[PDB]
Amino acid sequence: XXXXXXXXXXXXXXXXXXXXXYXXXXXXXXXXXXXXXXXXXXXXXXXXXXXXXXXXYXXXXXXXXXXXXX
Amino acid sequence: TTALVCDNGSGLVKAGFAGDDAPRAVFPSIVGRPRHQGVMVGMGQKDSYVGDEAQSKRGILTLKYPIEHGIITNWDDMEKIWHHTFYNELRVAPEEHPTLLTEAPLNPKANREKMTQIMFETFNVPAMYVAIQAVLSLYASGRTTGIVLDSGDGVTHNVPIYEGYALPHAIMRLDLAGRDLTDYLM
Numbered sequence: 001x002x003x004x005x006x007x008x009x010x011x012x013x014x015x016x017x018x019x020x021x022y023x024x025x026x027x028x029x030x031x032x033x034x035x036x037x038x039x040x041x042x043x044x045x046x047x048x049x050x051x052x053x054x055x056x057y058x059x060x061x062x063x064x065x066x067x068x069x070x
Numbered sequence: 071t072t073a074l075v076c077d078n079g080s081g082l083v084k085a086g087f088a089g090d091d092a093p094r095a096v097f098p099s100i101v102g103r104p105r106h107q108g109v110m111v112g113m114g115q116k117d118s119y120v121g122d123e124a125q126s127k128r129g130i131l132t133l134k135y136p137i138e139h140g141i142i143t144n145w146d147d148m149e150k151i152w153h154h155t156f157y158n159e160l161r162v163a164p165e166e167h168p169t170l171l172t173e174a175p176l177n178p179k180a181n182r183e184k185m186t187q188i189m190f191e192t193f194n195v196p197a198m199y200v201a202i203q204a205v206l207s208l209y210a211s212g213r214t215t216g217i218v219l220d221s222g223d224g225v226t227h228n229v230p231i232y233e234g235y236a237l238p239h240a241i242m243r244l245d246l247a248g249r250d251l252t253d254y255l256m
Protein backbone atom coordinates (compact mmCIF):
# COMPACT_ATOMS: atom_id res chain seq x y z
CA UNK A 1 0.00 0.00 0.00
CA UNK A 2 3.03 2.10 0.70
CA UNK A 3 6.75 2.67 0.77
CA UNK A 4 7.81 2.12 4.31
CA UNK A 5 10.25 1.79 7.11
CA UNK A 6 10.26 -1.93 6.37
CA UNK A 7 11.27 -1.41 2.74
CA UNK A 8 13.60 1.49 3.51
CA UNK A 9 15.42 -0.65 6.06
CA UNK A 10 15.51 -3.42 3.46
CA UNK A 11 17.26 -1.09 1.02
CA UNK A 12 19.59 0.17 3.75
CA UNK A 13 20.50 -3.37 4.76
CA UNK A 14 21.02 -4.52 1.18
CA UNK A 15 23.35 -1.55 0.73
CA UNK A 16 25.27 -2.67 3.82
CA UNK A 17 25.28 -6.29 2.62
CA UNK A 18 26.69 -5.58 -0.84
CA UNK A 19 30.42 -6.15 -0.44
CA UNK A 20 31.15 -5.81 -4.13
CA UNK A 21 29.99 -2.21 -4.41
CA TYR A 22 31.68 -0.67 -1.41
CA UNK A 23 34.89 -2.68 -1.56
CA UNK A 24 35.23 -2.12 -5.31
CA UNK A 25 34.57 1.59 -4.85
CA UNK A 26 37.34 1.98 -2.31
CA UNK A 27 39.95 -0.46 -3.60
CA UNK A 28 39.61 -0.18 -7.36
CA UNK A 29 39.33 3.60 -7.31
CA UNK A 30 42.33 4.00 -5.03
CA UNK A 31 44.34 1.45 -7.03
CA UNK A 32 44.81 3.76 -10.01
CA UNK A 33 46.75 6.66 -8.43
CA UNK A 34 49.28 4.40 -6.78
CA UNK A 35 52.86 5.51 -7.24
CA UNK A 36 55.26 8.38 -7.72
CA UNK A 37 58.80 8.46 -6.32
CA UNK A 38 62.48 8.17 -7.10
CA UNK A 39 62.53 5.05 -4.94
CA UNK A 40 65.24 4.60 -2.35
CA UNK A 41 65.04 0.91 -3.22
CA UNK A 42 66.30 2.13 -6.55
CA UNK A 43 68.85 4.30 -4.75
CA UNK A 44 70.13 0.97 -3.42
CA UNK A 45 70.04 -0.38 -6.96
CA UNK A 46 72.04 2.57 -8.30
CA UNK A 47 74.59 2.40 -5.48
CA UNK A 48 75.09 -1.32 -5.99
CA UNK A 49 75.45 -0.73 -9.73
CA UNK A 50 78.10 1.87 -8.93
CA UNK A 51 79.86 -0.85 -6.96
CA UNK A 52 79.09 -3.40 -9.66
CA UNK A 53 81.19 -2.95 -12.74
CA UNK A 54 84.90 -3.16 -13.53
CA UNK A 55 84.57 -0.48 -16.20
CA UNK A 56 84.17 2.05 -13.43
CA TYR A 57 86.18 0.26 -10.74
CA UNK A 58 89.37 -0.77 -12.52
CA UNK A 59 89.40 1.97 -15.12
CA UNK A 60 89.08 4.83 -12.64
CA UNK A 61 92.51 3.96 -11.26
CA UNK A 62 94.19 2.34 -14.24
CA UNK A 63 93.35 4.84 -16.98
CA UNK A 64 94.03 7.74 -14.65
CA UNK A 65 97.37 6.86 -13.08
CA UNK A 66 99.06 4.60 -15.63
CA UNK A 67 98.84 7.69 -17.83
CA UNK A 68 101.93 8.98 -15.98
CA UNK A 69 104.47 6.23 -15.44
CA UNK A 70 107.95 7.66 -15.11
CA THR B 71 113.66 -2.54 17.87
CA THR B 72 112.59 -5.13 15.35
CA ALA B 73 111.72 -5.60 11.72
CA LEU B 74 108.51 -6.59 10.01
CA VAL B 75 107.66 -7.89 6.55
CA CYS B 76 104.47 -7.82 4.54
CA ASP B 77 103.93 -10.39 1.84
CA ASN B 78 101.71 -9.01 -0.90
CA GLY B 79 102.14 -11.97 -3.14
CA SER B 80 98.52 -12.40 -4.03
CA GLY B 81 96.11 -14.81 -2.52
CA LEU B 82 96.03 -14.79 1.22
CA VAL B 83 98.39 -12.16 2.56
CA LYS B 84 101.28 -12.93 4.83
CA ALA B 85 102.95 -10.78 7.43
CA GLY B 86 105.45 -11.42 10.18
CA PHE B 87 108.52 -10.25 12.03
CA ALA B 88 112.04 -11.23 11.10
CA GLY B 89 112.95 -14.53 12.66
CA ASP B 90 109.59 -16.06 13.38
CA ASP B 91 109.34 -19.30 11.45
CA ALA B 92 105.95 -18.50 9.90
CA PRO B 93 103.74 -15.40 9.59
CA ARG B 94 101.33 -14.73 12.41
CA ALA B 95 98.24 -15.03 10.21
CA VAL B 96 97.19 -14.63 6.62
CA PHE B 97 94.34 -13.04 4.70
CA PRO B 98 92.90 -13.49 1.23
CA SER B 99 92.84 -9.86 0.12
CA ILE B 100 89.19 -10.33 -0.73
CA VAL B 101 87.31 -7.10 -0.52
CA GLY B 102 83.55 -7.06 -0.37
CA ARG B 103 80.62 -4.75 0.22
CA PRO B 104 76.88 -4.95 0.95
CA ARG B 105 74.41 -5.92 -1.75
CA HIS B 106 71.04 -5.27 -0.11
CA GLN B 107 69.11 -2.63 1.78
CA GLY B 108 70.10 -2.76 5.41
CA VAL B 109 66.94 -3.73 7.16
CA MET B 110 68.01 -4.59 10.66
CA VAL B 111 68.09 -1.05 11.99
CA GLY B 112 69.80 -2.54 15.02
CA MET B 113 72.76 -3.43 12.83
CA GLY B 114 75.68 -1.06 12.53
CA GLN B 115 76.30 -0.46 8.85
CA LYS B 116 79.89 -1.02 7.80
CA ASP B 117 80.17 -0.55 4.07
CA SER B 118 83.33 -2.57 3.31
CA TYR B 119 84.57 -5.92 4.56
CA VAL B 120 87.75 -7.91 4.20
CA GLY B 121 89.45 -11.02 5.44
CA ASP B 122 88.03 -14.06 7.17
CA GLU B 123 85.48 -11.68 8.69
CA ALA B 124 84.11 -11.26 5.21
CA GLN B 125 84.78 -14.92 4.46
CA SER B 126 82.19 -15.63 7.08
CA LYS B 127 79.93 -12.71 6.21
CA ARG B 128 80.11 -13.27 2.47
CA GLY B 129 76.63 -14.01 1.30
CA ILE B 130 75.09 -10.54 1.14
CA LEU B 131 78.48 -8.99 0.64
CA THR B 132 79.75 -8.99 -2.89
CA LEU B 133 83.40 -9.18 -3.74
CA LYS B 134 85.82 -6.90 -5.39
CA TYR B 135 89.26 -8.30 -6.08
CA PRO B 136 91.89 -5.64 -5.65
CA ILE B 137 94.66 -7.34 -7.60
CA GLU B 138 94.24 -8.36 -11.18
CA HIS B 139 97.07 -10.16 -12.89
CA GLY B 140 99.29 -9.37 -9.99
CA ILE B 141 98.56 -5.69 -10.62
CA ILE B 142 96.83 -4.12 -7.64
CA THR B 143 93.63 -2.62 -8.91
CA ASN B 144 92.40 0.08 -6.52
CA TRP B 145 94.70 1.84 -4.13
CA ASP B 146 92.36 3.12 -1.42
CA ASP B 147 90.93 -0.36 -1.05
CA MET B 148 94.44 -1.64 -0.53
CA GLU B 149 94.89 1.04 2.08
CA LYS B 150 91.82 -0.23 3.87
CA ILE B 151 93.16 -3.76 3.76
CA TRP B 152 96.59 -2.70 4.88
CA HIS B 153 95.39 -0.58 7.78
CA HIS B 154 93.16 -3.38 8.94
CA THR B 155 95.95 -5.89 8.80
CA PHE B 156 98.30 -3.80 10.89
CA TYR B 157 95.91 -2.82 13.57
CA ASN B 158 93.70 -5.87 13.85
CA GLU B 159 96.18 -8.67 13.48
CA LEU B 160 99.49 -7.03 14.11
CA ARG B 161 98.70 -4.44 16.77
CA VAL B 162 101.46 -2.47 15.07
CA ALA B 163 102.19 1.21 14.39
CA PRO B 164 103.93 2.31 11.19
CA GLU B 165 106.92 3.72 13.05
CA GLU B 166 107.63 0.41 14.64
CA HIS B 167 109.78 -1.42 12.08
CA PRO B 168 111.30 -1.32 8.67
CA THR B 169 108.85 -2.88 6.26
CA LEU B 170 109.53 -5.03 3.25
CA LEU B 171 107.42 -5.32 0.14
CA THR B 172 106.98 -8.22 -2.19
CA GLU B 173 106.59 -7.66 -5.86
CA ALA B 174 105.87 -9.30 -9.12
CA PRO B 175 108.98 -8.64 -11.21
CA LEU B 176 108.94 -6.76 -14.49
CA ASN B 177 105.71 -4.90 -13.94
CA PRO B 178 104.63 -1.28 -14.23
CA LYS B 179 106.49 1.37 -12.25
CA ALA B 180 103.23 2.76 -10.89
CA ASN B 181 102.90 0.03 -8.31
CA ARG B 182 106.32 0.97 -7.02
CA GLU B 183 105.73 4.67 -6.94
CA LYS B 184 102.29 4.82 -5.37
CA MET B 185 103.02 1.97 -2.97
CA THR B 186 106.04 3.76 -1.58
CA GLN B 187 104.36 7.13 -1.70
CA ILE B 188 101.38 5.96 0.30
CA MET B 189 103.31 3.91 2.80
CA PHE B 190 105.83 6.62 3.60
CA GLU B 191 103.14 9.27 3.72
CA THR B 192 99.98 7.53 4.89
CA PHE B 193 101.88 5.23 7.13
CA ASN B 194 105.12 6.66 8.43
CA VAL B 195 107.63 3.88 8.58
CA PRO B 196 111.35 3.76 9.36
CA ALA B 197 112.60 1.87 6.32
CA MET B 198 111.10 0.42 3.16
CA TYR B 199 112.05 -2.19 0.62
CA VAL B 200 110.44 -3.99 -2.30
CA ALA B 201 111.91 -7.29 -3.39
CA ILE B 202 111.47 -9.68 -6.29
CA GLN B 203 109.98 -13.05 -5.56
CA ALA B 204 112.70 -15.28 -6.99
CA VAL B 205 115.38 -13.84 -4.75
CA LEU B 206 113.45 -14.93 -1.70
CA SER B 207 112.72 -18.24 -3.32
CA LEU B 208 116.42 -18.93 -3.68
CA TYR B 209 117.31 -17.74 -0.21
CA ALA B 210 114.74 -20.01 1.36
CA SER B 211 115.62 -22.88 -0.94
CA GLY B 212 119.29 -22.08 -0.33
CA ARG B 213 120.92 -22.66 -3.71
CA THR B 214 122.60 -19.50 -4.93
CA THR B 215 121.94 -20.28 -8.59
CA GLY B 216 118.62 -21.30 -9.96
CA ILE B 217 115.42 -20.97 -11.91
CA VAL B 218 112.08 -20.57 -10.17
CA LEU B 219 108.53 -21.30 -11.17
CA ASP B 220 105.89 -19.90 -8.86
CA SER B 221 102.38 -19.45 -10.16
CA GLY B 222 100.44 -18.03 -7.30
CA ASP B 223 97.11 -16.40 -7.08
CA GLY B 224 98.82 -14.04 -9.52
CA VAL B 225 100.95 -13.66 -12.61
CA THR B 226 103.13 -16.63 -13.30
CA HIS B 227 106.85 -16.53 -13.50
CA ASN B 228 109.99 -17.82 -14.98
CA VAL B 229 113.23 -16.37 -13.68
CA PRO B 230 116.61 -18.03 -13.94
CA ILE B 231 118.78 -16.52 -11.27
CA TYR B 232 122.45 -17.18 -11.35
CA GLU B 233 124.30 -16.89 -8.09
CA GLY B 234 124.47 -13.26 -7.04
CA TYR B 235 122.96 -11.74 -10.19
CA ALA B 236 119.89 -11.10 -12.33
CA LEU B 237 119.33 -11.90 -16.01
CA PRO B 238 116.35 -9.60 -16.54
CA HIS B 239 116.35 -10.27 -20.27
CA ALA B 240 116.08 -13.98 -19.51
CA ILE B 241 112.88 -13.61 -17.61
CA MET B 242 109.38 -14.67 -18.56
CA ARG B 243 106.20 -13.42 -16.94
CA LEU B 244 102.74 -14.85 -17.53
CA ASP B 245 99.11 -14.20 -16.60
CA LEU B 246 98.07 -17.82 -16.30
CA ALA B 247 97.47 -18.04 -12.58
CA GLY B 248 95.02 -20.35 -10.91
CA ARG B 249 92.21 -17.82 -10.57
CA ASP B 250 91.66 -17.51 -14.31
CA LEU B 251 92.00 -21.28 -14.57
CA THR B 252 89.27 -21.59 -11.99
CA ASP B 253 87.02 -19.30 -13.95
CA TYR B 254 87.61 -21.59 -16.90
CA LEU B 255 86.57 -24.37 -14.56
CA MET B 256 82.98 -23.18 -14.61
Ligand SMILES: Nc1ncnc2c1ncn2[C@@H]1O[C@H](COP(=O)(O)OP(=O)(O)O)[C@@H](O)[C@H]1O
Nearest residue numbers: 078079080081082220221222223224225248249
Ligand atom coordinates in the same frame (compact mmCIF):
# COMPACT_ATOMS: atom_id res chain seq x y z
N1 LIG C 1 95.18 -26.22 -0.94
C1 LIG C 1 95.45 -25.67 -2.14
N2 LIG C 1 95.69 -26.42 -3.23
C2 LIG C 1 95.97 -25.86 -4.42
N3 LIG C 1 96.02 -24.54 -4.63
C3 LIG C 1 95.79 -23.68 -3.62
C4 LIG C 1 95.49 -24.20 -2.29
N4 LIG C 1 95.32 -23.14 -1.48
C5 LIG C 1 95.49 -22.03 -2.24
N5 LIG C 1 95.79 -22.36 -3.50
C6 LIG C 1 96.03 -21.40 -4.59
O1 LIG C 1 97.33 -20.86 -4.41
C7 LIG C 1 97.30 -19.45 -4.61
C8 LIG C 1 97.52 -18.73 -3.29
O2 LIG C 1 98.09 -17.45 -3.58
P1 LIG C 1 99.68 -17.36 -3.77
O3 LIG C 1 100.21 -18.68 -4.26
O4 LIG C 1 100.25 -16.82 -2.48
O5 LIG C 1 99.83 -16.31 -4.97
P2 LIG C 1 101.05 -15.28 -5.13
O6 LIG C 1 102.13 -16.06 -5.83
O7 LIG C 1 100.46 -14.16 -5.94
O8 LIG C 1 101.43 -14.92 -3.72
C9 LIG C 1 95.94 -19.18 -5.22
O9 LIG C 1 95.98 -19.39 -6.63
C10 LIG C 1 95.09 -20.23 -4.53
O10 LIG C 1 93.91 -20.52 -5.28
